[PDB]
From a paper:
Here, we have applied a transposon-mediated directed-evolution trinucleotide deletion (TND) approach (Jones, 2005; Simm et al., 2007) to the commercially important and widely used enhanced green fluorescent protein (EGFP), an engineered variant of the original Aequorea victoria GFP. EGFP is an important tool in cell biology (Tsien, 1998; Zhang et al., 2002) but still has some limitations resulting in further protein engineering endeavors to improve properties such as stability, folding efficiency, and solubility during cellular expression. Using directed evolution, enhanced green fluorescent protein (EGFP) was observed to tolerate residue deletion across the breadth of the protein, particularly within short and long loops, helical elements, and at the termini of strands. Only correctly folded EGFP variants bestow the fluorescent green phenotype on E. coli.
The overall structures of EGFP and EGFPG4Δ are very similar with backbone and all atom root-mean-square deviations of 0.6 Å and 1.2 Å, respectively, suggesting that deletion of G4 is having a subtle effect on structure, predominantly at the local level. In EGFP, G4 is located in the first organized structural element, a 310 helix, which is relatively distant from the chromophore. Deletion of G4 results in a significant local rearrangement of residues in the 310 helix and the helix itself. K3 rotates by ∼120° around the axis of the 310 helix to reside at the position previously occupied by G4. First, rotation brings the K3 side chain into the vicinity of the cis peptide bond between M88 and P89 with the NZ group being within hydrogen bonding distance of the backbone carbonyl O of M88. Second, the shift in the 310 helix to accommodate the K3 side chain repositions E5 and generates a new polar network. The carboxylate group of E5 is now within electrostatic bonding distance (2.7 Å) of the NZ amine group of K79 in the adjacent 310 helix, which in turn is within hydrogen bond distance of the backbone carbonyl group of Y74. This new polar bond network absent from EGFP now links different secondary structure elements in EGFPG4Δ. Folding analysis revealed that EGFPG4Δ retained more structure upon unfolding and refolded with almost 100% efficiency but at the expense of thermodynamic stability.
Numbering used by the authors: 1 to 3, 5 to 64, 68 to 233
The structure:
């Protein structure tokens, strides 16, 4: 039921996102590679419609948890890989405290040797001069724990966590994330015991790139379950 064999080695990744936030329409493409044995991602994203209308860090969680490293004793809890190659739908609602929300739907699946994440994002209720549309977020990311449980009603998982976005005046903008994942295929999947992913992300710029872009490295390992339990 585990699909670890698809994830051997380095796997190319493609990402495509169409988004509309307070009627500002935009698109983002990304390409890179993942190594689930190490739990590491490297990707570069470009805004193909001009300047991104929201800050890049707000799109990090939207823009492939199947590349998480699952420990030796936790292979029976890896839902994300178990749903491949047909893949899973990942839906979120993200509430930015004192501001608007994003709602997202994505399909993550293999197209051949490439892992692809295809996303629609709709943003509503943002303040024109808030931290988001105001572009008051620093260009950086912090470490978070992403809590995963099995869905008690359907074949799938329920996931929640709270992202801290640091603001240029020293304050912090919180983004509460609520997430569900369901398989696309009707094959068996792994429905995990409660656990979490320890997430770290670092953002940078390619000094030669003139398009609006984001270079992103991530390291993710699952944790939280006692051997054999
Ligand atoms: Na199998
Ligand atoms: Na605007
Ligand atoms: Zn172990
Ligand atoms: Zn158990």
């Amino acid at each position: 039921v585990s699909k670890e064999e698809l994830f051997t080695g380095v796997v190319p990744i493609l990402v495509e996102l169409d988004g509309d936030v307070n009627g500002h329409k935009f698109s983002v493409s990304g390409e890179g590679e993942g190594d689930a044995t190490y739990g590491k991602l490297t990707l570069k994203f470009i805004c193909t419609t001009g300047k991104l209308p929201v800050p890049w860090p707000t799109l990090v969680t939207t823009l492939v948890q199947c590349f998480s490293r699952y420990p030796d004793h936790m292979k029976q809890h890896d839902f994300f890989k178990s749903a491949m190659p047909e893949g899973y739908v990942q839906e979120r609602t993200i509430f930015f405290k004192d501001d608007g929300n994003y709602k997202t739907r994505a399909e993550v699946k293999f197209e051949g040797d490439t892992l692809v994440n295809r996303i629609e994002l709709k943003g509503i209720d943002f303040k024109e001069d808030g931290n988001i549309l105001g572009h008051k977020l620093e260009y950086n990311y912090n470490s978070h724990n992403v809590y995963i449980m099995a869905d008690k009603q359907k074949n799938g998982i329920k996931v929640n966590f709270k992202i801290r976005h640091n603001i240029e005046d020293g304050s912090v903008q919180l983004a509460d994330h609520y997430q569900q994942n369901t398989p696309i295929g009707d094959g068996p999947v792994l429905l995990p015991d409660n656990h979490y992913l320890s997430t770290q992300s670092a953002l940078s710029k390619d000094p030669n790139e003139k398009r609006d872009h984001m270079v992103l490295l991530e390291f993710v390992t699952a944790a939280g379950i006692t051997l054999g339990m």
